[PDB]
From Swiss-Prot:
Subunit structure: Homodimer.
Region (Autoinhibitory (AI)): 6-22
Subcellular location: Cytoplasm, Cytosol; Membrane; Endoplasmic reticulum membrane; Nucleus
Note: The cytidylyltransferase may interact with membranes through its amphipathic helix.
Organism name: Rattus norvegicus (Rat)
Family: Belongs to the cytidylyltransferase family.
UniProt name for this protein: Choline-phosphate cytidylyltransferase A
Length: 22
């Protein structure tokens, strides 16, 4: 299994944007 991990570090690629966004 290695799909769950991709969700935890993809959500982070949107999190990054949450940075300077807020």
């Amino acid at each position: 299994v290695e799909e769950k991990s991709i969700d935890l570090i993809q959500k982070w690629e949107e999190k990054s944007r949450e940075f300077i966004g807020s």
